[PDB]
Each structure stands twice: as structure tokens, then as C-alpha cells.
Design a protein around this ligand. Sequence first.
Ligand SMILES: CC(=O)N[C@@H]1[C@@H](O)[C@H](O[C@@H]2O[C@H](CO[C@]3(C(=O)O)C[C@H](O)[C@@H](NC(C)=O)[C@H]([C@H](O)[C@H](O)CO)O3)[C@H](O)[C@H](O)[C@H]2O)[C@@H](CO)O[C@H]1O
Ligand SMILES: CC(=O)N[C@@H]1[C@@H](O)[C@H](O[C@@H]2O[C@H](CO[C@]3(C(=O)O)C[C@H](O)[C@@H](NC(C)=O)[C@H]([C@H](O)[C@H](O)CO)O3)[C@H](O)[C@H](O)[C@H]2O)[C@@H](CO)O[C@H]1O
Lengths: 49, 237, 237, 237, 99, 286, 286, 38, 38
Amino acid sequence: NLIVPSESSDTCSLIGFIAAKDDFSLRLMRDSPDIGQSNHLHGAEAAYQ
Amino acid sequence: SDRVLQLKLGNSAIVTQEAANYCCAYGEWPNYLPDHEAVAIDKPTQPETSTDRFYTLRSVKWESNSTGWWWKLPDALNNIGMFGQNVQYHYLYRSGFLIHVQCNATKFHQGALLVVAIPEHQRGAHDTTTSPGFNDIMKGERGGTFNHPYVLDDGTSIACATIFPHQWINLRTNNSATIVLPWMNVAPMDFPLRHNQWTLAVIPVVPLGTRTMSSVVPITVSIAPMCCEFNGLRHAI
Amino acid sequence: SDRVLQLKLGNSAIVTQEAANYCCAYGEWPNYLPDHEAVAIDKPTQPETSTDRFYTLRSVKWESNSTGWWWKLPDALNNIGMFGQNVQYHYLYRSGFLIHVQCNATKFHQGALLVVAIPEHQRGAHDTTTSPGFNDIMKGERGGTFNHPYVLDDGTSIACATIFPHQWINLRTNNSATIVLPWMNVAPMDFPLRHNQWTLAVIPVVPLGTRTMSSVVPITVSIAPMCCEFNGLRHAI
Amino acid sequence: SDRVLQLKLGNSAIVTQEAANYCCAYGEWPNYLPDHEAVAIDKPTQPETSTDRFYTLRSVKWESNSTGWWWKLPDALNNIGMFGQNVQYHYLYRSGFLIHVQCNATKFHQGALLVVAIPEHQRGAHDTTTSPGFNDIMKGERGGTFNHPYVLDDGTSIACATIFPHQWINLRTNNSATIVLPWMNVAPMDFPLRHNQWTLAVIPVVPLGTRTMSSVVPITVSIAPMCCEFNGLRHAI
Amino acid sequence: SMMEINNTDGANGMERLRVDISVQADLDQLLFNIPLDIQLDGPLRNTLVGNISRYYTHWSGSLEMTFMFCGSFMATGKLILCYTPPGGSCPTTRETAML
Amino acid sequence: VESIIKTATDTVKSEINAELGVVPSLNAVETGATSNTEPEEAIQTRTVINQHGVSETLVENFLGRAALVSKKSFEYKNHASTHKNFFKWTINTKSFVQLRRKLELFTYLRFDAEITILTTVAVNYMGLPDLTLQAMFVPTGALTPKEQDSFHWQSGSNASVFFKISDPPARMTIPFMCINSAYSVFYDGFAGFEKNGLYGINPADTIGNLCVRIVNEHQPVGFTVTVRVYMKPKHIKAWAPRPPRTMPYMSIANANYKGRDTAPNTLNAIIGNRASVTTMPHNIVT
Amino acid sequence: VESIIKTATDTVKSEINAELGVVPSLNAVETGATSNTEPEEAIQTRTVINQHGVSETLVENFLGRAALVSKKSFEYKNHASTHKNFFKWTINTKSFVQLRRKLELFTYLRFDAEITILTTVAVNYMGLPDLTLQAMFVPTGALTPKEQDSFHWQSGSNASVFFKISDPPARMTIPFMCINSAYSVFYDGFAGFEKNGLYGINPADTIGNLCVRIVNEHQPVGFTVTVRVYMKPKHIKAWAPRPPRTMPYMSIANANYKGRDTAPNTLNAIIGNRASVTTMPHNIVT
Amino acid sequence: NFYKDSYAASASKQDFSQDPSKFTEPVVEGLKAGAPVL
Amino acid sequence: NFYKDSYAASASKQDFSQDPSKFTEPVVEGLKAGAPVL
Ligand SMILES: CC(=O)N[C@@H]1[C@@H](O)[C@H](O[C@@H]2O[C@H](CO[C@]3(C(=O)O)C[C@H](O)[C@@H](NC(C)=O)[C@H]([C@H](O)[C@H](O)CO)O3)[C@H](O)[C@H](O)[C@H]2O)[C@@H](CO)O[C@H]1O
Ligand SMILES: CC(=O)N[C@@H]1[C@@H](O)[C@H](O[C@@H]2O[C@H](CO[C@]3(C(=O)O)C[C@H](O)[C@@H](NC(C)=O)[C@H]([C@H](O)[C@H](O)CO)O3)[C@H](O)[C@H](O)[C@H]2O)[C@@H](CO)O[C@H]1O
């Protein structure tokens, strides 16, 4: 159990991290689903003016 | 240096940053049954990682008036994981055990637990001539509690219990106890469902106390069988 | 000389005095997974005798109008003995199989059974576009029966099924068939509960017949996993 | 051993008894511009001790609702001591930086600060297409604060900010962070008043908390330029 | 890099990057779980390994999760972190996860 | 520390550990170093000779793809009474998000750029004309044509490429041309000596202007002509990786952000929500 | 047992046989082995130096042929008010029976796949437009375009091939890309951890999605455009041959069968009937 | 093959190795010519 | 490359050198396996 004295906060935080080890391998490149656009970005058309 | 420790067996690992060295019962270490000591002639199965790994039992709460707890081996694990399956499907078993008892608190808490591994701890009943019954002895994963820890529930004494392999968990000093147990028996193997080689006893000789914020202080037991071997295969009991 | 045979694995043994040599699928023999082909990095458990032994399934009755029977592996054994326990407690498994089909009768009986081990026997359903369901495929220890053995229940043909590892049990000649199966898959190991590497099919191409006293003529299947390895230990599914 | 540290440059020195080793950005160390990488042909001035020394900036207060702070280099020091004078009198400058962030509290306090050195930290503005202005970027010795630390005020994320040279100040563990920064740019030297090579960011990922006596908990930044070189001498801007 | 484990309604910004644990009244308490597909949206998606991996379709290799306790020095405790290979439903009790 | 890696690392078998003073699974995130705990130290492993290649993640391959950087449609007709049969494009790699996000995974980049130009036409039916186009490279802020037929198109020194719609897409390589040793993908500074300049825009990182015209005089009818430009970096060197973009892009001139209206990728929550930290999404219900 | 065979085996002359204990023509089918009786042992043979080659039956050649795997016709026009100038195809080798039956003669197959794309057009007459098409490879269940002009076509990382109808068919090779050591032509299992998944469909064996669009904006009139995709496996390795398909195929998702209405290839009779087992079809009537 | 990836190469029609016995005679004990099989 | 300018050449996909430690372990004092970090 988490055990703390009266003057310590009785609710504490954990920060979790993750990473790949060097036995990792990735294959078959594809476009990332994490970014996309519906219209021209602001200023894009001004590059033609 | 002798206060930090990592134990790794199979797919399990445990670390402690507040240990007190660790005990090897009678200065021995677990090992597989040699040919010159073997009796059962069938080829044994040695599961290795599926059974020689840490099994954590349900925790218990250390209270101001607690008398102590006990867990018998292999009974406590006879129904847990692949160790439990091998035990149920085989007439004979053999193994050592790596015991790790855990209990942390606060630098404002005090208390001392005797953590002792008792070989052949034959319990006695109090104030009656009737011998203890099956249900008084076989508690399984839950374990039991001491009625009269002062005499180890067997008419002897906890005072001299230090003659058995042990460590202590003195809150101001450490937060865990570790004991390595070799196979302990008069026979090379045994029937796991009717005989317990060792009994893990955790007894608060000095009660839990503090004047700071009151919190539930648990005691947790993790046990890893070592060098497991099973013979006499059949159906599950 | 090639008509008598004894198979011994673990605590099990089988003899036949009317065999027909025996088949080693694709001329191979089971073996443990070598380091240069391994993928899962955890240390595997190799139970040996507790799993690499003969498991006899419930028999079936060979009748004058029978269409044939099938058993998928490892499904048929996923709930039997210690092999079943290891399968349930581990995400990954790997093994070969020693198959022995048994069927005796009388020198006045006639009949011929095709005993074939089919790799990846993906069943098809009859007269519908709907794919076979989970319960149509996973029969377990009981196995299933052929609806249209003529096309191996997959739109192909039993006539050309001899392209797969097989033997026959022709009553006037032999009373048993034996086939040794190596690990057969595109991966070094697999999840045992959702994929069957092999399908044992026993089909009466020539029906059972006689003019002597009528008796129940059973067909029995005994299967011994070989070189079992399990990885990815966790709780039982 | 790796918890105590003394940094000494010029007439300045700093010690910490609760460090966590220290970071050398990208495993590099500051150095003077070699002849084979030089562009400006005038003989540079290398002030050494008058500029390569620790400059302590005004402290900031870590509050329960703080979002984080940042200081851009060399902007933060462009008006401090002899480093500031050389910067104002020369068109070109070059240097590395030794960063030491300080924050102590109590064994009853909790909190975690990410201390990261970001190369080319180009800020973005929130909810507008208008680019950040000169005064939004050049804060000098006072530094600025994060509006949305969650996305590093640039539409990315603090979660992945660990890809940059960094350390953490986790109150129960250490009371200071140290990062050594080499010259980081695509050119051998640069005009110090319009471009900032690095941005020091200190962000409380885990807020300051305690139940003991409340006190003002400051965060202090001390920065020492390293291997300073200046070219293009003229009047002060 | 930081996993967004507390990806829940009510958790805003950086609150989503930390998991709070409290002093418990009961034993063997489940504190949190984490879905593991680094190729799908969840706590692992916006990480260095997650972001780069999503520019690909196939992956192989071991992953490592490191947790830093950020309570006060006077706070103590023991936690058990378990990885359960696929096959069944996510464990909800320590006795099961511990296997 | 540096070495040649052609495959993922192998795994060595490991035994039981019970050593005092040795705790490989414990680390100190505060140091800034990533955990060095090896699988062999966390669990018992077997030996594995790993043959998995690592070449598809080489930076050269990761960024080595022809990505769309410009798309412009205009009317080809008699403009007697808007892009009058030609247009000018200030080259930039910030208009299309897929290429932009990948380049922004790095702080500095050095590379040569292979440019491919694809042209398509549509009648505003009697067939599609096989027009000849001219793409002239005009340096930074340099003099660009103002008419489809101005003298500027004589291209005495500027490089010009003439191509037909019926030919394969035009292609040529622009060398790494930065005045510095590498392009600045991000620039925490102001491009001028005064205080009113643009923030985050280092002129040194603008490859230049691309002026494209239809060489043919207008036809009796009008057509819509679309020109697509693709860029593929090669001979790449990259430095200092960065946190990936999460918030949608707003402008090509800055990193301004707003976030989606609702998660995922909202300013308040990057990852989509689940009911609680003990709720397992996609839990297997067997 | 293994050896190099480049021609059919020769025949050796044989003499009269009358040996006790030697019966080469007798065998035991029950063993599962095929008869080993040689011609020389069954009859008196002469010597024959056989020079017949065996290369046309090499697996590489048997499967090494570009076979049609996809054929899609759609309307190219203004879809203001169905495949709107583009389509998406989940790659599979089960739609056209000739290729399917051959691949299904094997259990496992490892091969690289040469893809050839053929395009034809027809007016719905004033001539045929030489359109530019884009074929983008989008991985398994990955994000596909929803409009002829969506941003997805910018193809920042996905491989895209742009080709004209007037050019020879487009062509490229997709490597053996299975996550396993070989593709599973047949799969006796379920692709998911739950029980409701699809049977016989291992996702690992789906090469991916092929998204094809006409790049040109629509013309004033409509056209019918048909795209045909051909696949040729090469660098082939094959394992465990299987019984050939006899019943007509019913679905691309399974091996379901029904059979023809009447023989041949009816569920009840694969071979066509003859009057009796003593009736010789095509008997020579001299 | 002028391409950098070996899988792009033309076909490989030169593997004349064969072992029919894995299909024709997968019996553990070899069958001798002329001798009774059983 | 038949062009006279080297920058016109095809891609260079042969640089397999790596040094993850500049990102994973940029600490001045190396961390030994098993030993307490602090
Ligand atoms: C398509 C499918 O198989 N299932 C759909 C559910 O996933 C979907 O529920 C939402 O799914 C979201 C997925 O997260 C991403 C993703 O595609 O991986 C995260 C990306 O970074 C994000 N990209 C951008 C540029 O914002 C992307 C994008 O927002 C969506 O594709 C647009 O819809 O989403 C996420 O987990 C959500 O929190 C979750 O609710 C349901 C919704 O009804 O539909 C299923 O078909
Ligand atoms: C074409 C010719 O020279 N003679 C014709 C006769 O052969 C035909 O009588 C029928 O012939 C059938 C032939 O068997 C196959 C074949 O073509 O070899 C067997 C194939 O597997 C089958 N294919 C499929 C996909 O089902 C194929 C097919 O059914 C037919 O081509 C379709 O008509 O037939 C078979 O032996 C029949 O049993 C037999 O009656 C007569 C019929 O009038 O016409 C002759 O011209």
C-alpha cells in the first residue's frame, strides 16, 4: 500500500514512460493517421501572390 | 550494497531497496534430485519457468492487536498457476522455495515482525486432547493465524524460534525479508496434498505503532518454487 | 518385421501386431525450436513427459453408412491432461504429433479407411455463401464428421487427398495406421486456441461389410504431442 | 558519488549535494571554433573568465497552479555582465552553456519538474493565424511562461519533449538539474540579438504539493556561457 | 517518452500525463491498466515510439515501460506491474495478473 | 558508442538472479537517461538470433519519398477580360501536412531535392491539347514574369525546363542550396535587423520561386490546367529529432495551434478518452 | 533423396525375370507410399536415353505468369448528383478462378509480386482523352481517400504510381511482405481473439489496399474507365501440395461449395457418366 | 537487376533440385525393390 | 550517375552507423548494468 505520514500529501503521482529496446524493427511505410487536412492552410494561397 | 536486492525467476522479478542481506536456510541452496538419491524410476518432468517463478498471495493487514500469520508449503500454492496444475496431476513433487515477505510503513512507524521458515511445523490444539483436524491445518492460499504465538501454537516457544531459518522486518531498518529454502524432507520426493515440508510464519513480536496519520499497513507474501520436479503422472485430483 | 511396432512416449506405450510400416509426414521428424528460427524471447517451458505422451480420445463406431470423422489439432487435445493445462496457461505453443489410429475386426470383415493428416484443412460450408462458424469448426475431443467426404468438405476431392501424409487401414491387411507429424506452420509458434495446424481425417472409402456375426466395430484415435514448447505464460483462459 | 557535484568556471562555483549525475547534450562538450569550420576572418576575441562564468537570473515562484517557465539563450543573458557587453559590441557570437536549475523543498513536499533544453524552440501562438511578435519572444533575463505546456506552446507535446537534452527535478530525489550545452546551430557563429539557439524550459509535470507548513518554494536558474568567442567588433547596439 | 495513461474525461492537459495513487483502505487494490497496441489510439499513441511506429505497418521487438514515483520522500510503498500476454480478458485481480 | 547496425539485436539466454547490490530493473528517470534495463535482466530469456533488418527506418528512406508540395489549378484561355495562363509559386514545404510533419520531426536537415512536375488538363468536348509548359526557377525574391509572354521568360541564366503534357512528368534535382551547412526546419529568431520582421522564417531556408506558364497561345476555348509539384529529398543528413506535431496545422508561416473541436488531438486532450484508468478499451470478451 | 533433375529419367534394358521371393509388381497401398514398381521390372524394356526437359513444370514457371486479379469499371464524369472518379480495392487473389485454383494447389507460398496495371477508356464520339491516373498503395485497414480530390492523395509516405493511359501498363514489384515466413493459402483458424471473427481469413495474408483515381478533373462529357490489375509471383517457394478444386467457387471469403447442376463437377459426381464400367467412351470403331 | 532491392529482380528459374520421396515414400523404413512390402 | 554533378546521383541508402546513446544516455558518467543509478 502507499503509506505516508500526516504532513506528506496522501495522493501521489506516477509518470509512466515507454520506449523500444534495440531488438526493435519497423516495416512497410505508410502515411501517418495522426495528421490530416481538409482545406488549404492559412497563407498557402498567398505563396502564389 | 546488502540493502538493495533483485530476485528474478521465470517471468517474474522483485526488487527491494531496504533489505537486510538474505537467508539461505541452513546455508544450503535448492537443487534437482541427483541420480544417487532418486527412488521413483519414471522420468520426471522439470517445468522450469512455468513453475519456478514468484506467486504473490493475498495480503493480510497488520493491526495493533494482530497475533501473527502462517502459510504452509506446498499447500498454499497447490492451487495456483502451473505449479498447482503439476501438483494436482502428479502423485510426487519436489522443490525448494524462495520466500520474500514485504511490509513497508513510515519513518514514524515502529514494529518488528519475526519471519521464520519452520520445517515440519506440526500444530497443536489448545486445551483439549483432540488432535487438530484437516481444516485446522490445510488453509491453502489464505493461510491461517496464530492462536498463541507465544508458544508457536505447538507448546514450545517463539523465543527460541530463531533456531530456525529466519529474518526480521524491523520497520525502522528494513521493509522486506528474504529466505531461500532447499528441499527439506526425509524422502527425496513427497505427495504434495497431505504433507507440508515448510511453514512460513510472520509474527509481530513488537506491535505496530505510531502517532502519525493512521493507515492500513499490509504484509504481503511472494513465494517462488525452485527446481520443481514431478513424478507419478495421472489425472488431476 | 514391418508389421509389428511399439511406440513409447512418457508413461505411455502402444503395440500393434498388424501395422503397415509407418509414415513420417514429408519425411520429417519433430524437433524443438532452434535459436536461429526463434521469435519469442522468453525462456520456454519444455514439459517433456507430462505432455509428450499418448492421449486416447473417445472412440467412434464404424457403421455401414458412416461418412467419416475428423479431429483438429491442437483443438482436440486443448483440454486434456497437462498438455491442455500448458495450452490454457500459455499464449504460445509448438509441437509435433504422433498419431495412431486403431481399428480391428475379423478375417471375415472387409473395409478400407483412409487415414490422412491434412495441413491447414480449412472447411467449407455446403450450399451457402456464409462461412462456417466457430462451433462448426471447434469440436474439441469429440471431433466432427464429414458431410461430403467425396469433396473433403472443402470443394476439392478425397481422390487426390493422398497428396497429404497418410496410410490406410484395409481390414484384410492391417488394424492400425501410424503417422508422425512435425510442426507445420508458417510461424515458429502459434496461439493454440484459434488455429489448428493439422486435421486428422479418417474416411471409409470402402464401407464396412461382412456376412458373419454383426458386432460393433470401433475406431480409436490415440495422439501423442511431441517436443512440446510453450511461451507467454499468464493465467488460464 | 554521482549525487554530489561542484561546477567551477571563472570566479564562480556551485555545489549541490542532491544531484542526479548530469547531462551533456547529445553527448557533446563545448569547444572553440576550429579553423576548418571558420567563416568570419577577423581575429576573434576570447574573453574567457569575464564571460565564461555563472550568471544567476532572478528566481521564480513554484505555485500549485504554475504552468512552467522558459528562458531563451542568448537573449536571457544579452544584457548581463561582460557577456552582455561583448554581445552588444560584436555582430557575431558563439558559445556553449552550462545550465544549473535549482529547487529545494522538504522531505514532506512532492513535485516533479521537467528541465529540458530545446534547440530552435520556435513558439506558436494560440488560436490565431497571426505569428508571435517580437515582445512575445524576447523576454530577456525575466524569461516567459508557458500558456499550454501540454503542447509545448508549439502544437507538439511535452510528452515527447524527452527527445531533447533534459533532466528532472523530482523533489523526493534531487534538488538540482545540470545540462551542458554545446554550440547548436547550422552556422559557426550568429548575430546574438535576433536568434536564440536554445530555450531552457522548466515545467511542473507533477504539481507542487504537501500537507506541512506552506512556504514559498523558488526555482532558480544559473547559466554559464562556455568557450565564448566574438567577431565583428563595432559600437554597442 | 510519457504515456498518456490518464486519458479520461475530466483530466485536462498535463493531468492526463500522470496517474494519481492514494493510500488505500482495502488490500490488493487495482490501480490502473494500460491498453498495449502502439498502433492504435490510447495511452501509447502520442509517444516517440508510438508516433514513429505509426508511420509503419509492421513491428517487432521488446518495449520497456518505466515509471517514476513522484510522491514525497517520506512516502513509501510497493506496487506490482504486470504484463499479460494475449488470449483472454484483462485481469482485474492481483492473483490473476501476478501469473 | 557509435557502431554499424544492420539487424535488430540478438537475445541471450539468462538464468535466475538473486544478487545483493544488483538491481537492474531500478533506474533514475531524473538523470535524463532512458532506462538501460535489458530483457535478460528483467526475465529469464532464451537465445534468439534476430535477423530482422533495420534498413526501412534509415533516415534516407524515411524521408526519401516524393511528396506533394504544390498543387495549382488555373484557367488556360484568352484572358482579355487571376492566373492568366501562368503562375508564380514561392517554394515552401509547409503547405501539405504529410510532408511537413515528417520534416518537422527534425531540427536541421541537409539534402538535395528531386523535383517532379505533373500536369493534367480538362476542357471547360473535342479532345485534350498536348500543351508545352515552361517552369523557370527564379531565385529568392528575384525578378519574376508578370505576363504569359513577357521577355523574362527568355531565361538567359535562370534554369528553365520545357515539357509536354504527353511526356512523363518533368524531373530535375535542386542541390542542397542553403547558405548554411543545413536547412533550419525550425527557426527561433527574426529574419531581419529591425524588430518588425517575421518570426520563425529564415529566408536562407526558402529554395526559391517556381514560375510556370503554358507556352502555347490560348486556344478558341478554355481549359483548366493543374500543375502538381513533388519533392523528394536525398543524400540526407538529419540532426536533433523533435516531438511530433499533434495539433492540426493552422498556417504555413508559423506553428500556431488551436486543436480539434473534440478529442483526439484537441488542445485539452491529445488522446481520445476512455471511461476510467481501469477501463480496458477493446477488452477481449470471450 | 534430394537431387538435381534436369531431364526425365532414362530407361535401362531389362531381361526375363523368374526369381523366387522377388515380386516388384506387388505393393502395399496401406503404407501410404506410392508404388515403386519400375517399368524395367514390369516388362522387358530397351535402353532409352531420355532428353526430355522438365523445366516448364518448375514451380517458378508454373506460377510465374501475370494473371488478372482485379477488373473495375467506373464512370469518369461530373458526379454532382458509386465510384466517383476513383475506387478502393482490398487486394485479394480469390476473385478470379484461374489464378485462385493454381495458388490453391499449395498450402503455403512465399513470393514477391509483380503488379501490372492496364487502363482502357470508352466515351459514353469526339475522341479518347489521355488521362493521368494515380494508384496509391494503402496498407491493411489503413486510411483510404474518400474523395477524388481529398488531401490523402498527397501520398507523403504511401507509395503512389502516376501513369497515363497512352503509356505502357504501369508496373512495380510488391515484395513478399507477410509477417510470417510464407503466405497461408489456406488457414484453418480464426483471425481474432474473440469467437465471432471470420473463419479462414488470416489478415497477415492480405497484401493491402489499392486506391486508384483519375487525376484529371472531370470533362464536359462522361467516360467509362476500366482498370485491370495483373499479378505475377516470382522468387517462389511452395510447400505441401493439395487436392485441386473441383466444385465451382461460390465466394472469395471461403471454400464453400455447391457443385454444378449436372455432372461434370456436380457434388454427387465429379466425372461425367458413361453407360457402365465396361463401356469404353470414344471406342475406336474401325 | 539495376534496382537496389534484390526482390525487384527478374524470375529465378534455375532451381532443379527435387525430392519426390517426401511425397511418394514418406515411410520410416525404406522399401527395397522386389522385396515383399509387408 | 552519368551526370557531372554528384548531387544529381540516386539516393544513398547505405549508412548503417548509429549511436542511440547520444539521445538515450547523454549522461557524463556512464551507468553500469545492475548497479544503483544513484
Ligand atoms: C475506423 C475503426 O476501425 N474504428 C472507428 C473508431 O476508432 C472510432 O472511435 C474513435 O477513434 C479515434 C482513433 O484515433 C485516431 C486514429 O485514427 O488513430 C488518432 C489520430 O491521431 C486522429 N487524427 C487526426 C488528424 O486527428 C484520428 C482522427 O481523429 C479520426 O480518424 C477521425 O474520425 O483518430 C479516437 O480513438 C477517438 O477517441 C475514438 O472515439 C469510431 C467513432 O465513431 O468509429 C469507428 O469506425
Ligand atoms: C468439345 C468437344 O470436343 N466435345 C464435346 C463433348 O465433350 C461434350 O460432352 C461432355 O463433355 C464434358 C467434358 O468434361 C469437361 C472438359 O471440358 O474436360 C470437364 C471439366 O472439368 C468441365 N469444367 C467445368 C468448369 O465444369 C468441362 C465443362 O463442364 C464443359 O466444357 C461445359 O460444357 O467439361 C464431360 O465429359 C461431360 O460429361 C460430357 O457430356 C458434348 C456435350 O453435348 O459436346 C461436345 O461438343
